[PDB]
Tab-separated table of C-alpha atoms and ligand atoms in Angstrom:
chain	number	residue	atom	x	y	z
A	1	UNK	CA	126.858	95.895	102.067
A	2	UNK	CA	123.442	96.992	103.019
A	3	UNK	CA	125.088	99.161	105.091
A	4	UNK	CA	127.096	101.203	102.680
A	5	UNK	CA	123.937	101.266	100.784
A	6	UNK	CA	122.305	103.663	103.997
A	7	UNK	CA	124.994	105.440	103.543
A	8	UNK	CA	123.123	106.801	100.341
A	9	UNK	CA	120.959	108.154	102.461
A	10	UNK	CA	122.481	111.714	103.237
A	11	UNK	CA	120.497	114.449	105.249
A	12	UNK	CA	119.031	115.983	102.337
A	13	UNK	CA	117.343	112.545	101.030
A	14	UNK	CA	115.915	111.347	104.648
A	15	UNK	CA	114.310	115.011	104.410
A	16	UNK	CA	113.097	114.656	100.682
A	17	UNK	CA	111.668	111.061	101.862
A	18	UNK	CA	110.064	112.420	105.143
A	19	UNK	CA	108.824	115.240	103.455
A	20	UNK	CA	107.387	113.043	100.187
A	21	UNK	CA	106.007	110.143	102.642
A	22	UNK	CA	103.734	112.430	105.171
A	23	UNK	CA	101.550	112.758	101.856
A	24	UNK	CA	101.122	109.466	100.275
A	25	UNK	CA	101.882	107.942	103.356
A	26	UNK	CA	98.354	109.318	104.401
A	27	UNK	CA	96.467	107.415	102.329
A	28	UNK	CA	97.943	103.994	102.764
A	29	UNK	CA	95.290	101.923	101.244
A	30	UNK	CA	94.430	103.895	97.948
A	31	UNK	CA	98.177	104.766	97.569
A	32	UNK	CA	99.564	101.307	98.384
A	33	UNK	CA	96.719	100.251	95.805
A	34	UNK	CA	97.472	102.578	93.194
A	35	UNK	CA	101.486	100.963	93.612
A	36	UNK	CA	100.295	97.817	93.235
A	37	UNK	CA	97.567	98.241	89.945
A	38	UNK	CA	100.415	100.334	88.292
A	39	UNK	CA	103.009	97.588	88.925
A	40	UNK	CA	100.728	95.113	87.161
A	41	UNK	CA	99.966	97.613	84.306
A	42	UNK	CA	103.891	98.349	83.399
A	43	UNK	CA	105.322	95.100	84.187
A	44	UNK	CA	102.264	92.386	83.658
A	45	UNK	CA	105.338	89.972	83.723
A	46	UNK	CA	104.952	90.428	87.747
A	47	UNK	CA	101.458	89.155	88.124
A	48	UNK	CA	102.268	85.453	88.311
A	49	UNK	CA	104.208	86.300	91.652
A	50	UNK	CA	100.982	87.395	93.581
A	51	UNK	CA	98.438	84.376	92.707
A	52	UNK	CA	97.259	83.904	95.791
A	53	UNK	CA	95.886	87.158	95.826
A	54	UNK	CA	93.663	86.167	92.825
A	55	UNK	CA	92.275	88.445	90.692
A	56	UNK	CA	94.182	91.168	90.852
A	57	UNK	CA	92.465	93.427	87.862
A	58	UNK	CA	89.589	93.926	90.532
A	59	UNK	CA	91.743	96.300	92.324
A	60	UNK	CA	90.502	97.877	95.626
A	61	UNK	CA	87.226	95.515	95.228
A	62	UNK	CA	89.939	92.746	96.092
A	63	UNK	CA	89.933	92.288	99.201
A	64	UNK	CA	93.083	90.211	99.427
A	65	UNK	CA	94.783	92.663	97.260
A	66	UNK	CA	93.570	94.880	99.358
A	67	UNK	CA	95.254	94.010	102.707
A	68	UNK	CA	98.323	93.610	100.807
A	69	UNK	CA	98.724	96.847	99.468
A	70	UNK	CA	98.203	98.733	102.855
A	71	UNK	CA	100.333	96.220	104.676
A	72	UNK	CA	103.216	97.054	101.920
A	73	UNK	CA	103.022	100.585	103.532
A	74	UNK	CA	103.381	99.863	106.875
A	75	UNK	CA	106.610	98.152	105.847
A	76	UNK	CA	107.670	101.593	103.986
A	77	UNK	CA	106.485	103.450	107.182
A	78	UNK	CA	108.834	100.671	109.123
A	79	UNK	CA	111.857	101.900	107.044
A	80	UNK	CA	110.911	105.659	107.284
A	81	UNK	CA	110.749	105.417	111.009
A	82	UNK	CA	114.171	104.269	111.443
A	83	UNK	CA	116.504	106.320	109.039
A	84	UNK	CA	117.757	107.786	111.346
A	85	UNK	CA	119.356	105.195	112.802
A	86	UNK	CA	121.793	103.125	110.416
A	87	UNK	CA	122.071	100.050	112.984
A	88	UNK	CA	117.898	99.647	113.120
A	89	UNK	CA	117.341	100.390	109.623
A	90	UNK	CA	119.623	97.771	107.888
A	91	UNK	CA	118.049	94.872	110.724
A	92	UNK	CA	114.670	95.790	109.676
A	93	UNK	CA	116.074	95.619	105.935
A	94	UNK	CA	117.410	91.681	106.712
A	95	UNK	CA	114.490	90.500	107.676
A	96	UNK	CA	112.236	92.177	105.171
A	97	UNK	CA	114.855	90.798	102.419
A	98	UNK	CA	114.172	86.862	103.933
A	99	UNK	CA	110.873	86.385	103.057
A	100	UNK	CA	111.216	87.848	99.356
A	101	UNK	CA	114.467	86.070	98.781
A	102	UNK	CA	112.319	82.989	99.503
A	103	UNK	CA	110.025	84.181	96.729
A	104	UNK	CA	112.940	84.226	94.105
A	105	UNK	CA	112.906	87.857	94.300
A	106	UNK	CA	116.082	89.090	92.444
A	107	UNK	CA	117.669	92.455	93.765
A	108	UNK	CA	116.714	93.381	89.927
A	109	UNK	CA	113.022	92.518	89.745
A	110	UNK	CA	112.746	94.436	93.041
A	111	UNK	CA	113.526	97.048	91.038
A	112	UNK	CA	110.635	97.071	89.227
A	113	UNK	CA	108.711	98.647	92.063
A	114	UNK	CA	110.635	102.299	91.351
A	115	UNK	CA	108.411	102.803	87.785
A	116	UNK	CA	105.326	102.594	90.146
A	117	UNK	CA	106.780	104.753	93.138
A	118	UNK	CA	108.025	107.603	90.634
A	119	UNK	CA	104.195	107.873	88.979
A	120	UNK	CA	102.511	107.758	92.380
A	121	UNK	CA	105.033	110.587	93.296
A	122	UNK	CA	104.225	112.779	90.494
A	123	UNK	CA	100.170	112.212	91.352
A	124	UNK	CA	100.856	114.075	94.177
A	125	UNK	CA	103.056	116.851	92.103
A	126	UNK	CA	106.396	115.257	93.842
A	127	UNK	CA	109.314	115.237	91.106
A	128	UNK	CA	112.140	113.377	89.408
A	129	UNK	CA	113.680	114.733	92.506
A	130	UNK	CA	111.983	112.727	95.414
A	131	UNK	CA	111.692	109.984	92.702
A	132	UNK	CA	115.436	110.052	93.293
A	133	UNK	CA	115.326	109.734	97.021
A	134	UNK	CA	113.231	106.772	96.898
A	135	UNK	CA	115.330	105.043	94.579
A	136	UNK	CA	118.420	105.039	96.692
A	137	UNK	CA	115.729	103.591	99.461
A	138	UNK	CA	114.975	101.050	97.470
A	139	UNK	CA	118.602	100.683	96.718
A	140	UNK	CA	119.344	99.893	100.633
A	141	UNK	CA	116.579	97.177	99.964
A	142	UNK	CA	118.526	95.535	96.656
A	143	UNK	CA	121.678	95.373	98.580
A	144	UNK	CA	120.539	92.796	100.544
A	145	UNK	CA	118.677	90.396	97.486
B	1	UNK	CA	83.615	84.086	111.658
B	2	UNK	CA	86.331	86.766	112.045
B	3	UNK	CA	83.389	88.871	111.262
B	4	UNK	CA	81.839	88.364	114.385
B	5	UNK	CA	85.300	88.621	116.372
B	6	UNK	CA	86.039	92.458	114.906
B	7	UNK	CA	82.201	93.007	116.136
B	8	UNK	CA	83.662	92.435	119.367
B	9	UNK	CA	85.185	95.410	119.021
B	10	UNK	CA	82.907	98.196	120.832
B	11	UNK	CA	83.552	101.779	120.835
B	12	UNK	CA	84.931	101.831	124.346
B	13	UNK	CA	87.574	99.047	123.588
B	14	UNK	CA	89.021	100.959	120.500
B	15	UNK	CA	89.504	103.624	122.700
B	16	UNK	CA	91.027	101.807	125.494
B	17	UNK	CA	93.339	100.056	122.464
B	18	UNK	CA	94.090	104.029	121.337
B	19	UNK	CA	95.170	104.812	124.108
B	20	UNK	CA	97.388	102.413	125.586
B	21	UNK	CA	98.867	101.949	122.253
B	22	UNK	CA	99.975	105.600	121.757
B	23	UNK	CA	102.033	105.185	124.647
B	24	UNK	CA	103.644	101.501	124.172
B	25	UNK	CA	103.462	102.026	120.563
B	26	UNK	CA	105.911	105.381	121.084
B	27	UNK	CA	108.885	103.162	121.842
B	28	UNK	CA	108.600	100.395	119.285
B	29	UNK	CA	111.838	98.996	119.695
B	30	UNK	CA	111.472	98.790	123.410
B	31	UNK	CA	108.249	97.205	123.694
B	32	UNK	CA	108.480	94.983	120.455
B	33	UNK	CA	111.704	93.361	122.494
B	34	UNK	CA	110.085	93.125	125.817
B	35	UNK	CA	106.818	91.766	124.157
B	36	UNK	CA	109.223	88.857	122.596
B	37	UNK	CA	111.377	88.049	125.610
B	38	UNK	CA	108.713	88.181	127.874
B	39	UNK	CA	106.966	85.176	125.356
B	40	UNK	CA	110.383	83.368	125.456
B	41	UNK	CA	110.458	83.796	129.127
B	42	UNK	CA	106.896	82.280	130.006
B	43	UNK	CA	106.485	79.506	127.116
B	44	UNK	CA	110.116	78.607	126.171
B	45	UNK	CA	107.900	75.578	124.475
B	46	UNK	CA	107.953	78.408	121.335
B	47	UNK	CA	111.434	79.069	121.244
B	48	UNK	CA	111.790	76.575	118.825
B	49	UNK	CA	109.328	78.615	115.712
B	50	UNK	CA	112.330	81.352	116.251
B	51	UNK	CA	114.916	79.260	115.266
B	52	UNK	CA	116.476	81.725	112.515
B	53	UNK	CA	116.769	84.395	115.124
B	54	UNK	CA	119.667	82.855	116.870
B	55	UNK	CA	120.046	83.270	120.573
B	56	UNK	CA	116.836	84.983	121.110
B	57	UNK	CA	118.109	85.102	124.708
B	58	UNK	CA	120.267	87.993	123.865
B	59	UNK	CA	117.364	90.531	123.526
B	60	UNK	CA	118.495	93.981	122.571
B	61	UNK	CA	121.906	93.005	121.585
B	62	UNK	CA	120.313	90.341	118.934
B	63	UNK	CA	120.382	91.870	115.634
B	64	UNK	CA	118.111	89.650	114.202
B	65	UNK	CA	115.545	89.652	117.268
B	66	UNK	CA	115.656	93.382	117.519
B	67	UNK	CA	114.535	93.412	113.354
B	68	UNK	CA	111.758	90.859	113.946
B	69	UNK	CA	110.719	93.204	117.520
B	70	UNK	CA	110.379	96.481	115.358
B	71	UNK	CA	108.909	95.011	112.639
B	72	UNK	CA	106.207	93.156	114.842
B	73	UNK	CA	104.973	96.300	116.347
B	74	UNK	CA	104.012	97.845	112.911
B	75	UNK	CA	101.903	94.831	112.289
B	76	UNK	CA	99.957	95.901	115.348
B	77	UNK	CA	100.188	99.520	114.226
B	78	UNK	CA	98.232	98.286	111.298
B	79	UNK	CA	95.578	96.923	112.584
B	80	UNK	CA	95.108	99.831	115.446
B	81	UNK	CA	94.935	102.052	112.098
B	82	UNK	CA	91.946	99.711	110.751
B	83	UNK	CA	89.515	99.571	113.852
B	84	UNK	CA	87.470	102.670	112.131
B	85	UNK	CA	86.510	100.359	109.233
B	86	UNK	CA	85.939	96.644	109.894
B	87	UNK	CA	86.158	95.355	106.476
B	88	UNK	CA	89.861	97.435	106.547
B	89	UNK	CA	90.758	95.162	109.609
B	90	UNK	CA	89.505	92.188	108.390
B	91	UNK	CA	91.771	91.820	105.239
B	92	UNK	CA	94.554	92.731	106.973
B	93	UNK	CA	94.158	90.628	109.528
B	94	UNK	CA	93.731	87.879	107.130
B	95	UNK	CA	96.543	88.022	105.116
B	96	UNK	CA	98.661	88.518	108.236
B	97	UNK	CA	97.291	85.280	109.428
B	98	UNK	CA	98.680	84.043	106.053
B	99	UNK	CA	102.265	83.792	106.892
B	100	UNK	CA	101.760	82.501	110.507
B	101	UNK	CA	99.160	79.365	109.282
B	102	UNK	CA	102.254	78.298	106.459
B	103	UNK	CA	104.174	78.236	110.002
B	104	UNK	CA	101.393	75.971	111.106
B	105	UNK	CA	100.906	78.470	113.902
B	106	UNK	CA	97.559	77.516	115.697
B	107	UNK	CA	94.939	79.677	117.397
B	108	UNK	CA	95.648	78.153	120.183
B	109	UNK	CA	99.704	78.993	120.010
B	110	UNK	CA	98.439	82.501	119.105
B	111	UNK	CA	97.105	82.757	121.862
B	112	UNK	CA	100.163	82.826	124.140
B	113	UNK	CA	100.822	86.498	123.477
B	114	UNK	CA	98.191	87.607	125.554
B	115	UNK	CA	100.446	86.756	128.654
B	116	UNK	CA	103.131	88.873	127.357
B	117	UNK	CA	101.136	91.682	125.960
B	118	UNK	CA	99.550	91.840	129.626
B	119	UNK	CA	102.966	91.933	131.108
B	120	UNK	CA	103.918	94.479	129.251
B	121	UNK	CA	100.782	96.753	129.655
B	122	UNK	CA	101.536	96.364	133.296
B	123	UNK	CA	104.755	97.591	133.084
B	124	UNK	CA	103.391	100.739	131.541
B	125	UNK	CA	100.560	101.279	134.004
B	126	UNK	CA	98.118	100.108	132.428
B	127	UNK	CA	96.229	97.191	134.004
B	128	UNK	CA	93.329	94.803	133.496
B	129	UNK	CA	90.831	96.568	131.046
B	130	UNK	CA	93.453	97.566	128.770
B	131	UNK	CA	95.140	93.574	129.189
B	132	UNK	CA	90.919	92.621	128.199
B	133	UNK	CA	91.058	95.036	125.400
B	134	UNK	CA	94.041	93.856	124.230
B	135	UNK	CA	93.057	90.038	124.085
B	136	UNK	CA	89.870	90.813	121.566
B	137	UNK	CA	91.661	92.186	119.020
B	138	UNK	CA	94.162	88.781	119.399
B	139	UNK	CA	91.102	87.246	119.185
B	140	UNK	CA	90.440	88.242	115.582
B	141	UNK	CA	93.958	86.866	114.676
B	142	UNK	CA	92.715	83.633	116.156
B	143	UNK	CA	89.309	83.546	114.283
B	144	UNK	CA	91.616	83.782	111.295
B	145	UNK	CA	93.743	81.273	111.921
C	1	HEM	C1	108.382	98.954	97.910
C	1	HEM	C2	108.581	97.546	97.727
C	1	HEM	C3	107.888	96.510	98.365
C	1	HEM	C4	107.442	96.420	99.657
C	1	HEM	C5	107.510	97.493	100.737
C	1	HEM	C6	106.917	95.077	99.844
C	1	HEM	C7	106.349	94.607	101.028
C	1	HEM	C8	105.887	93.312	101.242
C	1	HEM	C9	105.264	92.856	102.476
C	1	HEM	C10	105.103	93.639	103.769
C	1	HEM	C11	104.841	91.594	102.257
C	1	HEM	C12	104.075	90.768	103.283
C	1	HEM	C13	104.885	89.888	104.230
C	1	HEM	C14	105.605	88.754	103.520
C	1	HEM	O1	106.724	88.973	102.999
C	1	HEM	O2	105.044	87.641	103.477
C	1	HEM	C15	105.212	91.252	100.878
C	1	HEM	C16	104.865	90.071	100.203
C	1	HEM	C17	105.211	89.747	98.874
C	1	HEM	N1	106.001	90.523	98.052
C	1	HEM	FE1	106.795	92.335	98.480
C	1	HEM	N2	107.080	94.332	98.705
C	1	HEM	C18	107.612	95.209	97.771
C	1	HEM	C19	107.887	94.890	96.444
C	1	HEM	C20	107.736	93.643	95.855
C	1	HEM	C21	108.049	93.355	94.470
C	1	HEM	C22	108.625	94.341	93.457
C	1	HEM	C23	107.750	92.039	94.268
C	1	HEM	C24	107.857	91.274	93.100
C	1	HEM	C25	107.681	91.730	91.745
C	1	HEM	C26	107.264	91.531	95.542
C	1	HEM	C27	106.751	90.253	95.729
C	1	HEM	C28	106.144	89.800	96.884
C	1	HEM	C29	105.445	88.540	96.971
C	1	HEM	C30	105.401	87.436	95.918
C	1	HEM	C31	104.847	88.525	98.183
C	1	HEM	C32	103.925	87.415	98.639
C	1	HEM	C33	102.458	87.729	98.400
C	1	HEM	C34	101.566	86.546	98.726
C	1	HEM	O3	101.410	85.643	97.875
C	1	HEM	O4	101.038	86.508	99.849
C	1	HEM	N3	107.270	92.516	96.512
C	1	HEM	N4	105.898	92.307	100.292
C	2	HEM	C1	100.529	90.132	118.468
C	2	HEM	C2	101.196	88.969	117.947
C	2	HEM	C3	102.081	88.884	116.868
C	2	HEM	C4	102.364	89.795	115.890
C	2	HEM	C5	101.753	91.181	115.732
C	2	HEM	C6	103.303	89.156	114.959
C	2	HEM	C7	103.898	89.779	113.850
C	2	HEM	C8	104.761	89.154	112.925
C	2	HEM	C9	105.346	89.796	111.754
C	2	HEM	C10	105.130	91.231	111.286
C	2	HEM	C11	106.144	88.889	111.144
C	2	HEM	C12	106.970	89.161	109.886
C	2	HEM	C13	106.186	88.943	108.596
C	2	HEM	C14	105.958	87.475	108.298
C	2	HEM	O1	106.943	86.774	107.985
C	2	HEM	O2	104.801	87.016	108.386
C	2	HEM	C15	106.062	87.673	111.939
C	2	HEM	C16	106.891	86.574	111.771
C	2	HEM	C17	106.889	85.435	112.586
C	2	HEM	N1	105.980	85.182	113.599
C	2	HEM	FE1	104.492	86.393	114.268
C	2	HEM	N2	103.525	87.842	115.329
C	2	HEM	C18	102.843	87.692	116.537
C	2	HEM	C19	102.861	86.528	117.323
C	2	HEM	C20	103.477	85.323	116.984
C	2	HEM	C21	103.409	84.116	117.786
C	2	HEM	C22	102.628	83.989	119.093
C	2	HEM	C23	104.190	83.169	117.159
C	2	HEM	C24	104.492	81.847	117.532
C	2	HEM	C25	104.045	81.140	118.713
C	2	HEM	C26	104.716	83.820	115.957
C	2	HEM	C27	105.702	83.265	115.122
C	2	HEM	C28	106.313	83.914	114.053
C	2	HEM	C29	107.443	83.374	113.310
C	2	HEM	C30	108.053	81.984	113.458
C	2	HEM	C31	107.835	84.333	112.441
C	2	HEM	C32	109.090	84.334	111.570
C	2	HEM	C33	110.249	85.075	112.225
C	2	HEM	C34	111.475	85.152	111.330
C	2	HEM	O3	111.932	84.089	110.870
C	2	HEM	O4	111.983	86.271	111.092
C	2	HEM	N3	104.223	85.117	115.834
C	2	HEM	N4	105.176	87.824	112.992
């Protein structure tokens, strides 16, 4: 239940992922970039989802991949923002989750985004530790693919 | 030319979209559900695009409703976040558009939320300029669409 998946998310983590999101939360578009170019570098398996972005080895030049990448964010700051309260957080989750699962998005591929998340993390000197918190966001996420 | 729409947007209508958003865009919840029932309430002819949301009728109390509200006010908190760089607001705004034209939502269906969004301004105090302000930036959706 998406549900008992926010229940993952005890004091300490929501503080961890406040604390870890005010900085690359900053710098939505060359952060939500970077996420995006280092997803398609570890996992090139990925690419074929995202063809009507085109070329995606252009990067921030992109302009399609580049309205994609800070809209991710704003879906990141949309999950943030609510943490606090189970109820809005796991609506906000259900909807997200429709659109993907149309995509053939298994709760497993999803999954693939933590590699990026954890090495955009440590750019900005954040540790396994907050690399940890995100994961059981991205957990709440899974639970409902 | 969406282009030419974002040049609409002068220096004294970013402000006046600054700062009536930093008040309507405090309570996102609130607003994002009065912003949709307010729509259902003057053009129940677009009831029918909400199908999956049940009884959008409900408002609050509509789980699925209150997911789509939320998450429709970060869209806007996007582009508000772009109007210092036009070429930022332009790719957003396009690949927004994206999702609405696979709808087969026209510019001129689009168009309905400037009722609404004037409504809801006016609940807030805020009245004409800031409904006029409001309507060019809807009018870059539409140029995309
Ligand atoms: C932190 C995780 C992620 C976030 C916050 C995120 C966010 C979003 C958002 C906001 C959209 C745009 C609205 C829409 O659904 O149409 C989107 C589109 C999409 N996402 Fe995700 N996403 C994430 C991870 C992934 C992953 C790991 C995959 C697959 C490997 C994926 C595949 C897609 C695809 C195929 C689209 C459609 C792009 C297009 O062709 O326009 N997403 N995502
Ligand atoms: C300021 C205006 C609006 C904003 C900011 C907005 C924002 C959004 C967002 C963020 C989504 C979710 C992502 C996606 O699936 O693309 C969405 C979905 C949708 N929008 Fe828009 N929208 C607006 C107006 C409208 C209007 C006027 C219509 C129709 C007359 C419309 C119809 C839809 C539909 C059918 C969905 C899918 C809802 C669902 O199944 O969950 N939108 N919109």
């Amino acid at each position: 239940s998406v549900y008992d998946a926010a229940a993952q998310l005890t004091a300490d983590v929501k503080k961890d992922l406040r604390d870890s999101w005010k900085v690359i939360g900053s710098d939505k578009k060359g952060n939500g970039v970077a996420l995006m170019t280092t997803l398609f570098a570890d996992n090139q398996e990925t690419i074929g989802y995202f063809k009507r972005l085109g070329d995606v080895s252009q990067g921030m030049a992109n302009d399609k991949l580049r309205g994609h990448s800070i809209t991710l964010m704003y879906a990141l700051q949309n999950f943030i923002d609510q943490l606090d309260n189970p109820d809005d957080l796991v609506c906000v989750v259900e909807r997200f989750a429709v659109n993907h699962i149309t995509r053939k998005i298994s709760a497993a591929e999803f999954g693939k985004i933590n590699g990026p998340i954890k090495k955009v993390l440590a750019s900005k000197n954040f540790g396994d530790k907050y690399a940890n918190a995100w994961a059981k966001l991205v957990a709440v996420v899974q639970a409902a693919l």
